[PDB]
Symmetry: C2
Subunit: 230 residues, 2 copies
């Protein structure tokens, strides 16, 4: 298509969101650039009314699928770029389990040289105790909290946490871990008070490696214990 | 309690795993280095007996929490470094829902200068049609598929997908997404055969930005259609 030719290079992006969640009105502005040749987006978003009343992760999918990399044998299936530069409307209903709902209406157009995503958002029926208005969602997507407790009868520690592996069909494969650590030597060990480990893992592959392999990068920090009149 | 002193610098890591899942024996070796000062690990793992009979993401938790960064006011709660260099035994039971069960016994200790994680794993009761032995697990944790289908009545598409936001207490906040796109223009558009966009996002913060903000990095690739008959 001809609209495809507008994404041959790097295209500046402007996002403008105006939202209203349970009466709390807010606005977001974002700026950055997209590179459909590699399917890469870089964006910075700013709340321009003060503090966001909902967590940032719940707004990621609302804040430009025309920057997807379509492999060559699929270029004829790229609805998104084919609609440019006049653009497309994008409507969504986002239903949070046991909580409120976002309704979403964006226009994704070209304004001059710039790809613009201009959104209205309306969230209703959110629970003030819930995970959204109560601000309980982790910020990085892959952050798992591993809650550690001491077990003085065993001279060690215990933990139990859930990993929910993404399944290729959009399903999830739950993995329920029960952990038990005990010292190998008979010297003294620090048994802890209740805290947790915030863990992040990034998996990747080395394309120059013939063997079945995993390249893993991990960031782990302990949390859950604050200062107490120090 | 003098064990934290062994983790002040960068420490070479050796990981060795002997496994048996539904009678398939395998072995993994892992090499790399850990930096407890920053809570950082970089490791490369190689299946040394051919192909791995399970998805790599199911082995990650099995394959060294003594490299976590304990803030200064908590160093008194660091069991893992405290048990060093004799080390600790780590036993787990991993229960895959509607599927089998891993049991793991590892010994994490210092052999010479190197921190060695030495595991024995046993998995029983796995379904051959299941997500594990059937290798249906995404490799990257933040990879989501946005499933796309044509809606020719409105001259556009329609998409559907789920996002599972992690909650601080360890549960998950599910978000069902129902998407509809139509063109603004009057010109002609491509209507697609069913496919999906494979989407990944990384979120971060500018420490020097005083306003409430989000810095976002995204990688999206259409997939789910294959080359036809040709060469």
């Amino acid at each position: 298509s001809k609209g495809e030719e507008l994404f041959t290079g790097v295209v500046p992006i402007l996002v403008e969101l105006d939202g209203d969640v349970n009466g709390h009105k807010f606005s977001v502005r974002g700026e950055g650039e997209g590179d459909a040749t590699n399917g890469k987006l870089t964006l910075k978003f700013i709340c321009t009314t003060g503090k966001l009343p909902v967590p940032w992760p719940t707004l990621v999918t609302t804040l430009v699928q025309c920057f997807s990399r379509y492999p060559d044998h699929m270029k004829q299936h790229d609805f998104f770029k084919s609609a440019m530069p006049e653009g497309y409307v994008q409507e969504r209903t986002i239903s949070f389990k046991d909580d409120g709902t976002y309704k979403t209406r964006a226009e994704v157009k070209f304004e001059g040289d710039t790809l613009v995503n201009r959104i209205e958002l309306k969230g209703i029926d959110f629970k003030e105790d819930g995970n959204i208005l109560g601000h309980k969602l982790e910020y990085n997507f892959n952050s798992h909290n591993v809650y550690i407790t001491a077990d003085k009868q065993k001279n060690g520690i215990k933990a139990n946490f859930k990993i929910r592996h993404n399944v290729e069909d959009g399903s999830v494969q739950l993995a329920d871990h029960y952990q038990q650590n005990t010292p190998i030597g008979d010297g003294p060990v620090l048994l802890p008070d209740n805290h947790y480990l915030s863990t992040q893992s990034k998996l990747s592959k080395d394309p120059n490696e013939k063997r079945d392999h995993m390249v893993l990068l991990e960031f782990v920090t302990a949390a859950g214990i604050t200062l107490g009149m120090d």
